[PDB]
Amino acid sequence: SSEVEVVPFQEVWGRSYCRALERLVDVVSEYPSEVEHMFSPSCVSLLRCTGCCGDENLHCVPVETANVTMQLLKIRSGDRPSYVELTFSQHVRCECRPLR
Amino acid sequence: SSEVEVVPFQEVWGRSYCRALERLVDVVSEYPSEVEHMFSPSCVSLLRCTGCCGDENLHCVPVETANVTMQLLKIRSGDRPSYVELTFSQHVRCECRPLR
């Protein structure tokens, strides 16, 4: 009864090995340059390549990307709230490759 | 059309609202103090409360935690590789609450 399940090494490794994983990211952070924090929600759910690779010199990178357009509330100090449509980058498939 | 789908505000908000989300985390950083990166995989998949709360004053926190025991490979410069069972903290349910 006090004995817990152990996730086997193969599963552990496979679960955390490089993949397109849903992550919640700060909207403003997705912008190239500084941009005032006037978005609601302030964070969105995007698929981003994540994972370790086992090989030190290797890291998880996208081999295929796409797009997702989301409707957010823009709240700038000086204007009336307004909805806007923003297209964000999506990472569809990932693979371990040579960092640099 | 050549028209793309727009994820409506309600869905966007709900998707990024405080929740227990699978995240890949560095094993060593789950340790209180400094530990040598002697684990393989170096990162594991854990449920972690993540999300924005519509208010800078509120933050996503767990209201329920649990455990997951995983089998990893310990590799120390000096010992022969060896499998070990590591128990990690799991976040089961999450909620937005006042900062600190």
Curated annotation (Swiss-Prot), chains A, B:
While the three isoforms are present in most placental tissues, PlGF-2 is specific to early (8 week) placenta and only PlGF-1 is found in the colon and mammary carcinomas. It is found in: Secreted. It comes from the Eukaryota. Disulfide bonds join 18-60, 49-94, 53-96. Glycans are attached at residue 67. N-glycosylated. Isoform PlGF-2 contains a basic insert which acts as a cell retention signal. Growth factor active in angiogenesis and endothelial cell growth, stimulating their proliferation and migration. It binds to the receptor FLT1/VEGFR-1. Isoform PlGF-2 binds NRP1/neuropilin-1 and NRP2/neuropilin-2 in a heparin-dependent manner. Also promotes cell tumor growth. Antiparallel homodimer; disulfide-linked. Also found as heterodimer with VEGFA/VEGF. Isoform PlGF-3 is found both as homodimer and as monomer. Belongs to the PDGF/VEGF growth factor family. This is Placenta growth factor. It comes from Homo sapiens. The chain holds residues 35 to 206 of 221 of the full protein.
